C-alpha cells in the first residue's frame, strides 16, 4: 500500500 503503508 501507499497511504495505508504508513502503518497508521
Curated annotation (Swiss-Prot):
Coiled-coil region(s): none
Top-level taxon in the UniProt lineage: Eukaryota
Residues recorded as bearing Leucine amide in the entry: 8
Descriptive protein name: Allatostatin-5
Organism of origin: Diploptera punctata (Pacific beetle cockroach)
